[PDB]
């Protein structure tokens, strides 16, 4: 029922999954054709990478960074990551502080990896499902 990439997905199914990912991860802000990561898209469509690896790619791109990172304090960036990548809001200040320090020490890419590498993300979306806003956890 959530936007998924089942095996033997058709070429249409991939385009649809790709749109879902752009919508989710770039926070429902439709992006110009020039902003698309066609190389990445193409690889997903071939079966070389999974939905999850595609999500990670978009979240670490200049496209995401320009929209959410460069013109925000990290505390707001973290909120946005939770929303885009985990489909929810932080439960606590603790959760933010954690990512705050991870970003301070390990940098932005590593922080992004952390949301997507989480057990929470594995259990909810795994390799083939596009993160969606869970109104209930
Ligand atoms: Cl690309």
UniProtKB/Swiss-Prot annotation:
Bridged cysteine pairs (disulfide): none
GO cellular component, one term: phycobilisome
Lineage: superkingdom: Bacteria
Domain PBS-linker stretches: 1-137
Subunit structure: Part of 2 PBS rod complexes, the conventional CpcG-PBS rod and a photosystem I-specific CpcL-PBS rod, both of which include ferredoxin--NADP reductase (petH). CpcG-PBS has on average 3 stacked phycocyanin hexamers (PC, CpcA and CpcB). Linker CpcG connects the PC stack to the thylakoid, the hexamers are linked by 1 copy of CpcC1, 1 copy of CpcC2 and the stack is terminated by a single copy of CpcD. The CpcL-PBS has on average 5 stacked phycocyanin hexamers (PC, CpcA and CpcB).
Family: Belongs to the phycobilisome linker protein family.
Protein name per the record: Phycobilisome 32.1 kDa linker polypeptide, phycocyanin-associated, rod 1
Covered range of the whole protein: 19 to 155 of 291
